[PDB]
């Protein structure tokens, strides 16, 4: 209800994108300068209100509860006749701020282009409609943008956070009374080509800083963060940031990795963990080319009065030490199981040094070989993993459960697991076991060839699975010694974050089929960690890397399905009256969302039924299928792009042939 007299002025800034000039001083950076970004000013534009160092290019955060009227005086100090246009506010044409063929009056057009050096009071009366609703977090996220040039203004700047919160929770400063802190997150692909000055700026920008040069962030422990994740960019850009060590809530859904695209504004929650700096980055391949390195320091502040609510159980019900001995071991492998290359690796080599047809591909991967003997010599885990490739063994990890991981490295390189989307839980706390964490408290020993050490993994009562989720949520894991080349190698695995009750580590609810994994991951063997020995020593070509190629950059790259190429996978088959509980994982560098489809048969999505499910990179998808149509049917893809086109599994359906019952 309060009358918000806001004073903001656009102004070109010779932005450095560096956190500070450093001891070298000066500003010799990318030629992205004179960036017109509006900044908040004192009442009557006495002077520009100071901006956060983290909010380098980020503009004035404009929180607003319902009922307010915002007297946004915009002195267009930038020398261009400009405008500012909101997105989701039912405004009036006098403060429309958007010029088009609305056939309106000049008084309702002056907003659409305000003269430079001229104050325009962009007034908008907020309403209860323009505010968070029921089942809605206490704040909502929006954007006001320069409608003068929706193409060039963004790259030239003119960006500012827009937030709308409920009454009561909103403070005078804009924080939530229920939230210890509020955090705003932004990414951009700032290009000087479509800017005021012209340059070929492929340089990527997290907030105001380039390719992972953020000044680090310090957050006290047990701090209720009301996050504000904003992803905007000119073209279609995916921002697949994983909160390493944190799980966030979006629309009553809990996920550790926050995958977003351009023009995405989001808010979430987290109560800050115990201790240790952390880094978050986008899983997009181009965001891997760039930094997007937002270092955040989770710190156990004594000046925080760590609540220690201890509203928990802390007891061995639902618990067991669950010693998963998944010691890493170098293996030979074939992407195509042309022969029935199933039943793990008993007859290992069996090869001919030929990348095609029979064994001889010699894709010398390094499996997470499961064991139960302490010495890890005998495999001791040889399950009925028929028609299964290099796949991490499933851990039916119930809520708040505990489990032990011990690695012995039977491979030429040091290795150590990264639980992605599982690290959100309190990890094995380390004070002497910091290892090569990168100062991010990632207890990553990178176990040397033949070395052995232990993981003490245990999750607390908070879980990714939720009533607005599935019984078990799919979260994978992989290595850390070299993400790109080792994912290109055979270093990947997966478990389940289970809210399940009747499982006992045996089966989530052993009444529906539990076939789960669909991993159309793309592996380039000319990108693998064992590129050298695999490609060179054990192929039908000389010992060159052969990146340059007719198609060997394309031959050695392949969108295999769970370690098996699509062309050499046998058809599925099940009998009727069955429900198949799936836990998918779209992890491959698809660069294009894929839409699977079941002929006749349909999916489930909470209550919704899909029958055609789109997929997103590096995300686990756990649903069931009501297989209700007899005969063979297609696990086909509707995108059907020639890149990953031959993806259709002829899963059969018959009326359960076995008559059983003895006679």
């Amino acid at each position: 209800a309060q009358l918000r007299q806001f004073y903001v002025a656009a102004q070109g800034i010779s932005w450095s994108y560096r956190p500070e000039p450093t001891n070298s001083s000066l500003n010799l950076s990318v030629t992205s300068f004179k960036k017109i970004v509006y900044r908040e000013y004192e009442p009557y534009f006495k002077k520009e209100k100071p901006q956060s160092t983290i909010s380098g290019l980020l503009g004035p955060t404009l929180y607003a509860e319902v009922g307010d009227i915002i007297k946004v005086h915009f002195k267009n100090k930038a020398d261009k006749p400009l405008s500012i246009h909101p997105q989701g506010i039912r405004y009036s044409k006098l403060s429309e701020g958007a010029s088009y063929l609305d056939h309106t009056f000049p008084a309702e057009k002056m907003d659409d282009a305000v003269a430079p050096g001229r104050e325009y009071t962009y007034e908008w009366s907020i309403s209860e409609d323009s505010g968070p609703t029921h089942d809605d977090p206490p704040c909502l996220t929006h954007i006001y943008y320069s409608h003068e040039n929706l193409i060039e203004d963004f790259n030239s700047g003119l960006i500012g956070p827009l937030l709308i919160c409920k009454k009561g929770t909103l403070t005078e400063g804009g924080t939530q009374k229920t939230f210890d802190k509020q955090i705003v997150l932004l990414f951009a692909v700032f290009d000087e080509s479509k800017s005021w000055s012209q340059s070929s700026s492929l340089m990527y920008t997290v907030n105001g800083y380039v390719n992972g040069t953020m000044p680090d962030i310090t957050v006290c422990a047990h701090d209720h963060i009301s996050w504000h994740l904003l992803g905007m960019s000119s073209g279609p850009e995916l921002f697949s940031i994983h909160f390493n060590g944190q799980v966030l809530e979006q629309n009553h859904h809990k996920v550790s990795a926050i995958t977003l695209v351009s023009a995405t504004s989001t808010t979430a929650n987290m109560t800050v963990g115990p201790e240790g700096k952390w880094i978050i980055s986008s899983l997009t391949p181009k965001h891997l080319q760039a930094g997007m390195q937002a270092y955040i320091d989770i710190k156990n502040c004594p000046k925080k009065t760590r609540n220690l609510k201890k509203i928990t159980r802390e007891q061995r019900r639902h618990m067991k030490r669950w010693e998963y001995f998944i010691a890493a071991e170098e293996v030979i492998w074939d992407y195509a199981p042309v022969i029935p290359a199933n039943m793990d690796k008993k007859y290992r080599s069996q090869h001919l040094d030929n990348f095609s047809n029979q064994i001889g591909k010699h894709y010398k991967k390094v499996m997470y070989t499961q064991y139960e003997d302490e010495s890890f010599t005998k495999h001791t885990v040889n399950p009925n993993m028929k028609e299964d490739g290099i796949l991490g063994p499933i851990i039916r990890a119930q809520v708040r459960d505990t489990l032990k991981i011990v690695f012995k490295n039977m491979a030429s390189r040091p290795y150590s697991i990264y639980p992605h989307g599982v690290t959100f839980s309190p990890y094995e706390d380390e004070v002497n076991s910091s290892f090569t964490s990168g100062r991010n408290n990632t207890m990553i020993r990178a176990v040397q060839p033949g070395e052995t050490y232990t993981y003490k993994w245990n999750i607390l009562e908070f879980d990714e699975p939720t009533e607005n989720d599935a019984q078990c949520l799919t979260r994978p894991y992989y290595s850390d010694v070299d993400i790109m080349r080792d994912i290109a190698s055979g270093l990947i695995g997966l478990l389940l974050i289970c809210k399940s009750r009747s499982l006992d580590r045996r089966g989530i609810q052993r009444a529906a089929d539990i076939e789960q994994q669909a991993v159309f991951a793309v592996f380039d063997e000319n990108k693998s960690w064992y590129l050298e020995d695999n490609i060179n020593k054990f192929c039908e070509n000389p010992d060159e890397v052969k990146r340059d190629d007719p198609k060997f950059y394309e031959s050695n790259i392949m969108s295999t399905i769970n370690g098996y190429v699509p062309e050499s996978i046998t058809t599925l088959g099940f009998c009727f009256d069955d429900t198949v509980q799936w836990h998918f994982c779209s992890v491959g560098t698809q660069n294009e969302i894929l839409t699977i489809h079941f002929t006749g048969h349909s999916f489930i999505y909470g209550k919704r039924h899909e029958d055609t499910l789109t997929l997103f990179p590096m995300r686990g998808e756990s649903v069931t299928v009501t297989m209700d149509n007899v005969g063979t049917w297609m696990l086909t893809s509707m995108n059907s792009s020639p890149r990953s086109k031959k993806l259709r599994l002829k899963f059969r359906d018959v009326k359960c042939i076995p008559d059983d019952d003895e006679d």
């Binding site: 997105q87 989701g88 809605d136 695209v261 294009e592 839409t595 792009s641």
Partner: protein, 50 residues
């Protein structure tokens, strides 16, 4: 009140955050949230109320 039935059909990640000039959407579901715009996710069918 008018119901939305905007759809997207596979293709190649053709996403579109449909801006509305002074309009606010409404989620139609078990939660019934309110939206400003929506990214047109390929392979997905979206229904809302306006």
């Amino acid at each position: 009140w008018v119901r939305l039935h905007l759809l997207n059909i596979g293709g190649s990640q053709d996403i579109h955050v449909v801006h509305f000039h002074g309009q606010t959407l409404l989620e139609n579901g078990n939660k019934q949230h309110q939206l400003g715009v929506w990214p047109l996710l390929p392979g997905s069918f979206k229904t809302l109320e306006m």
